[model samples]
Target chain A: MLTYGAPFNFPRWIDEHAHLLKPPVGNRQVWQDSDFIVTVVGGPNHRTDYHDDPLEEFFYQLRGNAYLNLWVDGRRERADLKEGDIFLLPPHVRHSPQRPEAGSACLVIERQRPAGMLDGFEWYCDACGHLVHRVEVQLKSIVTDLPPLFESFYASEDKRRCPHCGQVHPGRAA
Target chain B: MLTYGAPFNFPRWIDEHAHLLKPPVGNRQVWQDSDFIVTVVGGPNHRTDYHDDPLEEFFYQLRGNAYLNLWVDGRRERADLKEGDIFLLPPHVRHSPQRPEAGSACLVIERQRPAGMLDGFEWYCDACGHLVHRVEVQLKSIVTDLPPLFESFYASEDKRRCPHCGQVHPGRAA
Candidate 1:
């Protein structure tokens, strides 16, 4: 079931990812995942780190406005998503979220393998050449068991400095 | 919200408490406490469990007939529930479910908490005073991050045999 709430409480783990994209951004809560990963996003800022996965991702804006910059086959396309607008991104496509300062939130769902295997992927920042870390600690190990190869790739506290811009990411503890 | 299916699938965890009551019994699912404690009656016979935090509980019926027995001030009362019937169980009330064969399944909402807590309760047979053992394992854990206390209670493999009636109760294992 999908639900919405203001001043939304994002799961602690997802906060780590949110910090990477924008500081002072709100959160979206994920409720159910059988055929899809259903989540409610609440907040203003946007700009998700460029990433890709094997699953097909879709977003429905229940409230607010945002831009979805999808990179597929080395080309970039933009979609203006607002309340009642829904969009999809296919597999292996690079997509980054772009939220204006006005800040917006939406319901995001990703369709993947029934067994949930296709949901697994590593986040990478093309700008910094830094591998975004996965919040393995809070995840249900049975659902998103972090692979061993991805372990060493986790962004380190000190190395969180963006390679291109040298800006400190939000999740990094000073 | 309550929903119903023709024949309900009762998880192994609920089977023990369910067995005590007679057929023409409907499975009832309830969510109680600030933490979403989703109680399911009859559906997909698979073992399902989850952990959740505090939230209002929502009860809905999927199919068949079921009764919700609520204990208030040491008094037990029941509400006859059927498909499309929705009720909320206030937090911290002592309650149990009664499902007869006539009632196939009931689904409840687990709000605000992790998923694993849903599987914490063990099945007890009030009929023979025998606690059904091993049946808990047969049920699935639907949610994640469940409290250890909940898992401990259901993990006990000890079987309960009715001394008064000499009837062997079906433990959670089946």
Candidate 2:
């Protein structure tokens, strides 16, 4: 069952590689265990995709700052995270991490939920408030799985259709 | 269900607290959600008790260094956690944080497990390999709950009892 990770290699790893990326950029899984998963995510661009995790997510700003947008209880909320600042987000909330040009890096931690826990990504219509398609995902790797999800979401035009208002989500690109 | 945290109070809060105590020697509550708990744990004191959590425990050294002793899979392990090092510990594993006088500080993260999940404290005989009494605890606050547990462990004779070898654990003075 213990197939991953050594003793303690996170601090040295982050201290070494947090600067190797551009903004809106994301780094894949640094490491994970049966109970916890750690990933470094940041870049110089705004994130257009929103994530709804099945588990609680924590973000620690290590370098610059980050803007997190969330949709909770039918209301939108925002969080601005700076260096040494940590944010803990509840599960099932739709949220996105928007990275600025000055550059921001953060440590994301979450539990590896038990079996049958699936994550999702939903893009709302920028035109009018409408229900768009919500895609379910089984995450094998956040780094590996996320890019493809965004790629698919941005690529499809028909998936953006809002059946109620006849309005589709914009940014027809992932 | 979310009543404790605001949309974003982290950046300004950390801006106010990461320096609240003094860097290289720090204490802060980075942030926490309903399920995820985060805290900056450090001081000029030596921790003398062992802890066994019902949930995974994580530590990231923000400043200075830390010494962690763990009893994992029936084996004892020690880690010298320098600045930036992060350690993820599994549940039910007995461990102790030995803070040195040079002043070690670190960031700790863990989830608030479901109801019925309980924590434990164990003392091992310093003279011989023997099992001491264990105590069950329901922690309401990490900062507040820890001191009393350690105090009780280090001050009780019954808790220091080494059942197998008859060598009671030392450090009876709190």
lDDT of 1 by residue, B1-174 (tens): 011111122333354455432321122333223222345555333221221213334454645665555544444455665653544454444344555443265656543334443322333355653333322221232333223433443454333444455554443342
Q: What's the number of clashes in each of the models? A: 60, 9
Stretches > 4 Å off in candidate 1: A1-26, A30-35, A46-48, A101-103, A112-174, B1-174
Candidate 2 lDDT tens digits, B59-166: 777667777787756767776777767767767767777655333457788777576778887777766656676778776666556666666766776667777777
Model 2 C-alpha lDDT per residue in residues A44-126, reported as the tens digit of each score:
65467678899888887777777777786776777777676666777787887887744456888887767789998877766
Please name the candidate that would achieve the greatest DockQ relative to the true structure: 2
Give the range where candidate 1 chain B is weakest over 10 consecutive residues by summed lDDT: B1-10
Worst 10 residues of 1 chain A by lDDT: A1-10
Model 1: per-residue Cα lDDT over A1-174, one tens digit each: 113211122333244444333332344434432323445455554334454555445455645676666544445566666554544455556655666634345656543243444433334444664654432232332123433323333345444446556654553221
Q: Candidate 1: interface RMSD in Å?
A: 16.5
Stretches off by above 4 angstroms in model 2 are A1-12, A15-25, A72-77, A172-174, B1-33, B72-75, B101-104, B138-140
lDDT of 1 at A133: 42
